[PDB]
Design an enzyme around this catalytic site. Structure first.
Site, short mmCIF file in Angstrom:
data_model
loop_
_atom_site.label_atom_id
_atom_site.label_comp_id
_atom_site.label_asym_id
_atom_site.label_seq_id
_atom_site.Cartn_x
_atom_site.Cartn_y
_atom_site.Cartn_z
CG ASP A 119 -8.43 1.62 3.85
OD1 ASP A 119 -8.44 1.11 5.00
OD2 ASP A 119 -7.82 1.11 2.88
CG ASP A 160 -8.74 -6.54 6.27
OD1 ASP A 160 -8.45 -7.10 7.35
OD2 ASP A 160 -7.89 -6.37 5.36
CD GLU A 182 -8.48 -1.62 -0.41
OE1 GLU A 182 -9.41 -2.45 -0.47
OE2 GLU A 182 -7.28 -1.96 -0.35
CD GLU A 183 -12.20 -5.05 3.34
OE1 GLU A 183 -13.35 -5.31 3.78
OE2 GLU A 183 -11.46 -5.89 2.78
CG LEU A 197 -7.04 -0.59 10.56
CD1 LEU A 197 -7.28 -0.42 12.03
CD2 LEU A 197 -6.52 -1.99 10.28
CG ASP A 198 -5.39 3.51 5.95
OD1 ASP A 198 -6.53 4.00 6.04
OD2 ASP A 198 -4.39 3.97 6.54
CD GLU A 214 -5.91 6.24 -0.22
OE1 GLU A 214 -6.61 6.31 -1.25
OE2 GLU A 214 -6.32 5.79 0.87
CG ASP A 219 -10.53 -15.32 0.36
OD1 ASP A 219 -11.26 -15.35 -0.65
OD2 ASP A 219 -10.78 -15.98 1.39
#
Ligand code: F6P
Ligand code: F6P
Ligand code: F6P
Ligand code: F6P
EC number: 3.1.3.11
Lengths: 337, 337, 337, 337
Positions: free
Chosen positions: D118, D74, D97-98, D120-121, D280, D68
Site C-alpha cells: 500500500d 495517494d 491498494e492504490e 502510504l496506508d 496487512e 472522489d
C-alpha cells in the site's frame, strides 16, 4: 472561493505578532516571547527523530547529569527551554513543571508576559514515535509589584494565549491570541514556520472520542454513561469510533479536525485526572474556546478556577458543542440525591 | 583560555539584537529588520542546492514570468525578499538593485531603518556551486520628512551595519553593528542561526590576494605594480598565493580568515570596477573596518563618498592593514606628474 | 482541479547504476561499493555544513594542540569512508591520503574493486569556508595476487570509473564511465545523489584559463610563454577571464560546466608536480579526458603513469581540446635544445 | 585535548543487508529492490511532514472536487514506489491498494521478488495529522510461470521478509527475516534508515490491550467476553492501559516496543475482517509471529491464508504470547455449540 496562487511567499509566526502586534499599537514585547518557543517547535521537534536510542548522551553532547535513571532529554529540552526565556530579556514568571515551583525572573530580563508552559506533554512513552510536541501559556501579567511565583496562578479566561506545538510528521504551531486560532506548519528546508489553514473554529458534530477505555471498573456511573451513548447509541444510531493516542494533544488536536472529544476527570486513582492543568488541561482548552470550542472539566469550565496551586491538576472534556457539551445532559441524566 | 563546554545552548541572531538592543534602551525596532533577512540566509541558502537544473520552474511553483530568458530565480529570491521587508511593518527605504530605483515604503509599514541590500551578489555563474549567499546594508535613517528614494544615498561611515550572508557549505551570517563583527553559522536541523567565533578583527599579514589576474594588458601601471610585489616579491621574499573564486564575498570572506586582500578598481572596461557599491563594494568594506579592517578603493576610502546615485558602482581593496594599505606606498611609488 | 507536486519515478544514482550496467548483464555488483561509498560522501557534506550539535566548536577548550598541523575532521571523515566501504565486501585494495600503506579487506569478503581516494580533500580551505570537495576513484582489477602496492599501480586508461564530489551549494557526485560524463545532484529531503544533470561536455575553446598566478616564478617555460597568449589572445579579440576557485576540486568543476584551462606545472617544492596519480590523476583526470576535455601532467599524461609509491605526486594540466592542445603544442614546439 | 563528533563506521540498512545475507553467500541481490524500495519510504516521510515548497496547499483554489473521496498524495506516493522499484529489475509481481490488477516488470528485467504493499496506508489520518505509516511486504518466489494473480497467493510462512515504516517522529523502516526483528531508524542528515535499534522482542504478558472500543457492538463473542478480562484482570491486580494510536500502523508499533493486545474481529461491514492478506496479514503479521508475538486473524491465522483476490480482507489479531494465546484459548474454549 478559488484562486490558490503560486509561490514567492511564506507565513511565519514572527509576522503574526510583528503584524497584528503593531495593529494593537504596542512594543513588540509580547513577541520577544514565543519566538523563543518558535525556535523550540523546531528545536525538540527533531530531538525525537533521534530520541530513540543512539542519539542523546555523548552522541549529541549530553553532560548535565539530571535525575536518577528515568530521563535526561526531557530535562535537556527544558534545560535550554529555560534560559532561552531569559534570552528574551522580557520574561517575568517562567512557569515550569519540571521545577516544583517556577523561577522568579531577575530585575534585568523582565517584562509583563508570564509564560506558563509544560516543557513536555509527558513524551515518556516516546517508544513508538507518537503524536507529541511543545506546550505553553501566558498572561499580560495582571499585577505590578515584585513578581513572586504568584501570577502564573491565572485562569485561561483572563489568559489571552495558551498553546502547544504538534510535531506529528508536520511540525505545525497553531498560534492563537484573544481572537482566533491559526496553525504554522514549519518548513525545515527553510527552518521556518508556515501558517496553513487561516483561522480555526471548533467543529460541532464529531464521531470519535478520547479518554481511556482500558478503564471500565473504576470510572463513574456518570462518565461511564456518556460512554454508553457512543457504544450503544440509543434511538437507533451508529457507534462513535475512537483512537486514543494516549496523548492529550494527539487527541485534542484531532478535535481541531474531523471530530474528537476528550473525556478525562478524576480517574479514581487520581482525584482530578492526570493533567497539571496550568500548563496541561489548559493550553488546548483555551485554543478550542477561541475557535468556538466549549472546553470544560465536566463538573467545571476549565478556564474558570482560583488556581489553588501552580502544579495543580484538573479534568478537561471538549470538542463538538453538541457532542462535548452533550455530557451536561448526561451528568444531568445521572441526577440522584 | 580553555573550558569549551557541553550543550544545552545556542546563539541565534534574534538574541543578538533582542539582547544588545535593550542594552541600548530602545524599541526592538532595529530588530524587526534583519530577522526577515535571517529568514533569508536560510531561504535562498538552500535555493542553490537545487538552483542547478530540475529545480525552479514547476518543480517549486515558479510562475511570475520575469525577464527575457536570462533569469528568474534571482528575481524570485528578491521577489519574496521584497514584501518580506514590508512584513516587518518597520521598513522605510527598501533599497534594491533589481529595480532601477528603490521603492518608497507606504505610510503603514514604515520605520527609521533604511535597508540597502543586494538581493544577490551576482550568483550568475551559479554553475559550479561556488561561495555565494546574501547581501545587505542599513542606516538609522538620518532625515525625517516623507522618505523619497533619497536616504539610501548614505556612506558606510554613517552606516552602522552593512552585511552579506555566506552559504559555502556553512550558512554563516556574520552580523556586526557599530561595534564589532560576529558570525552566525546556521543549524538547519533546527533551522536556526548560531554564532560561532565571538568577535572579529581583520588580520594584519596575509598571503593570498584577490582581483582578476586574467586581466594583464588593460590594467594600470599602479595596480599592475602591487601585483609585481606579490609575484616578484622584491628584497628576497616569497610569492603571494591566490585563489579567485571570482566572487567579492568568497574572497572578501577569506579575508575574514587566513589572509586575503581584494584589489579591484576601474577595470578599464568599466570606469570604477564592477561593484554597485551601495550594496556591493560596501557591506564587506564596512564589516572589515569594525573588525579593524582598512577598506578602501585605492584612490578613496570606500566608506566616504557623496553617493552620486543609488546604483552607482565603485572600487574596493582591503585586508591586512600592512598588506592592503601597502598599496598606498605603491600608488605612491608610481608617482609621476 | 489539477494536482501537481513532485517526481514519482525518481532517477536515483542507485537507479542509473542499476540500469546503466545493463549493456551486457552488469552482474549487479558495481553499485555494491558505490551505494556503500555513497553514504560516506552523502554524509561528509554536513561536516563542513553542520556541527551535529557540537563539533570542534565546544568540547574542552582552546588548547594549544600545535603538535600537528592537520584538522581532526580528516580522520572521522576518512575512517567513516574506509569503514562504510569494506562492508560491501567488494573491496580489493585501498589507498588514500589520510592513511598510510595499502590496507585491504579480508578474503572473508573482497569483491573486485580498488577505490583510491582522499577522505575530503581541501579540508583546511573550509576554515576560510570555501565550498571545497573531494577526489575519489575506484578500480575493477586484474589480479590473482594478494594485494601488493604494485596492484593499484595502474594509469587512468585502465579504470572502471573515476569519481568525486564537492559539498558546496549541494553536493554533486561526479563519476566517469565507458559511456561518458554524468552529474548526480543531492536531494537532502531524502539524502540523494540523483541524476539531475544528465550528460556533460564543455565548450570547445573556452575563454577562461585556470591556476594561481601568484605562483608566477614557479612554473616551467610553457605556461609562462603561454599565459599572455590568453591574456591578450594574439587574435587581438576576446581575452580570458578567471574564476579560479582556489581549491583544486572546483578547479575542475566550474570549468567543466564551462570550458577553461586548469593545470599544475613542476615548480620548486614540486619537481614531480604534487597531485598523486592514484587519487588526483586517475579520478578527476580520468573524469576529464573521458569528459572530452584534454588532461595533461607535464610533458607526458595521466592516462599513462605507474608510481613507485601509491602516493606519488603526478602533475595535472587540463581543459578544452583547443584550450589544452595549444599548450601540449606549446610543449610540442617547446621541445627546444 | 581529545576530539569526539560522530560515528565513522555507520550501520546503514544497506550495510546490514550487505552483511546479513552472508549466512550462505547471499548472492548480493536482496538489497537490490530493498535500497530501491528504500528511496521511496525515505522520500514519502516529508510528504506528510513537508510540502516541497507548495503541495495541495496552494495551486488553483478550493474547488469542490467531491467526485472522489481519496487524497491525491495517494498516487504520487504510490507510483513513485511502483516506479523506483521496477528499476532494480528484481521485480516479479506487484500488488497494492492504490492500484488494481497484477502489474509486472517485463522479462527485460525481472529478478525474484514480489513486493505487495500500500503506498502510504493511513493517509487520511494525516489530515487529523497523526503520525501514521505504511505496511509493505516483499516475495522471493517459486515460479516458472508468467505472473498470474495465483502467484502472489502465498501465506506468511512463505515470504523472505515483511516490512513497513511509520513516518512519525522519524521514520523507522521495519522488516522481519529468518534471524529475527530489527528496527532501522532514519538519519535525515543524509537520509538514512540505519540499524539503530538492533534486535527486538516484547514483554511476555503485556498489561495493555488494543482496539477501538467504540466498535463495542461489532465484534464476535470472544473479544467481548474477553475485554473485561483485561479491564479487571480476574487476578484482581494490574488492569490494562491503552495507547491505541488509532491508525493501524502504530497499532502494531508502540505495542511492539512494549507488549499489548492489538486485533480485528469480523463485524457488520466486515464478515471477513478488512486488512488484506498480501499487504496487512503477510507483512506486519509476518513481522509479528516472527517477532515472537502471536498473530491471529479470526479463528485461523495469517501465516496460512490463500486469497481469491490479491485484495482479500484477512482479519488480524496480535500481541504477546500470553496476551493473545489467552484469546486463541478463548476461541479454543469458545468452540461452543
Ligand atoms: O495515562 P495515559 O492514558 O497514557 O495519558 C498520558 C498522559 O501523560 C501526559 O503526557 C502527562 O505528561 C498527559 O498529558 C497525558 O494525559
Ligand atoms: O567578473 P568576475 O571577476 O567574474 O567577478 C564577479 C562579479 O559579479 C558580481 O557577482 C556582481 O553581481 C560581483 O559582486 C563580482 O565582483
Ligand atoms: O595557492 P597555492 O599555493 O597554489 O594553493 C592552492 C592549491 O593547493 C591545494 O591546496 C592543493 O592542490 C588546492 O586546494 C589548490 O589547488
Ligand atoms: O475507528 P475505526 O472505525 O475502527 O477506524 C480506525 C482503523 O481503521 C483504519 O482506518 C484501517 O484499519 C486504521 O487507521 C485504523 O486501524
Amino acid at each position: 472561493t478559488d484562486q490558490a496562487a503560486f509561490d514567492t511567499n511564506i507565513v511565519t509566526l514572527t509576522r503574526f505578532v510583528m503584524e497584528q502586534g503593531r495593529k494593537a499599537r504596542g512594543t513588540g514585547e509580547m513577541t520577544q516571547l514565543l519566538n523563543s518557543l518558535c525556535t523550540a517547535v523546531k528545536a525538540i521537534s527533531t530531538a525525537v527523530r533521534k530520541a530513540g536510542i543512539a542519539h542523546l548522551y555523548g552522541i549529541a553532547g549530553s553532560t548535565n547529569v539530571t535525575g536518577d535513571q528515568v530521563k535526561k532529554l526531557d530535562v535537556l529540552s527544558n534545560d535550554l527551554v529555560i534560559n532561552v526565556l531569559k534570552s528574551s530579556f522580557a520574561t517575568c514568571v517562567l512557569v515550569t513543571e519540571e521545577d516544583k515551583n517556577a523561577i522568579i525572573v531577575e530585575p534585568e530580563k523582565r517584562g509583563k508576559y508570564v509564560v506558563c508552559f509544560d516543557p513536555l506533554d509527558g513524551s515518556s512513552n516516546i517508544d513508538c514515535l507518537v503524536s507529541i510536541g511543545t506546550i505553553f501559556g501566558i498572561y499580560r501579567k495582571n499585577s505590578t509589584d515584585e513578581p513572586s511565583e504568584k501570577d502564573a496562578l491565572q485562569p485561561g479566561r483572563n489568559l489571552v494565549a495558551a498553546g502547544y506545538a504538534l510535531y506529528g510528521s508536520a511540525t505545525m504551531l497553531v498560534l492563537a491570541m484573544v481572537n482566533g486560532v491559526n496553525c504554522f506548519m514549519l518548513d525545515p528546508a527553510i527552518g521556518e514556520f508556515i501558517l496553513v489553514d487561516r483561522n480555526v473554529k471548533i467543529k460541532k458534530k464529531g464521531s470519535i472520542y478520547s479518554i481511556n477505555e482500558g478503564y471500565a471498573k473504576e470510572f463513574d456511573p456518570a462518565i461511564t454513561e456518556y460512554i454508553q451513548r457512543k457504544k450503544f447509541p440509543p434511538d437507533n444510531s451508529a457507534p462513535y469510533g475512537a483512537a486514543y493516542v494516549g496523548s492529550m494533544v494527539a487527541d485534542v488536536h484531532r478535535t481541531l479536525v474531523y471530530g474528537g472529544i476528550f473525556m478525562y476527570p478524576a480517574n479514581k486513582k487520581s482525584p482530578k485526572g492526570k493533567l497539571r492543568l496550568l500548563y496541561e488541561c489548559n493550553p488546548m482548552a483555551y485554543v478550542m474556546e477561541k475557535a468556538g470550542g466549549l472546553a470544560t472539566t465536566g463538573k467545571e469550565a476549565v478556564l474558570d478556577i482560583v488556581p489553588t496551586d501552580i502544579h495543580q491538576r484538573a479534568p478537561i472534556i471538549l470538542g463538538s458543542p453538541e457532542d462535548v457539551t452533550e455530557l451536561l445532559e448526561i451528568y444531568q441524566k445521572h441526577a440522584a440525591k
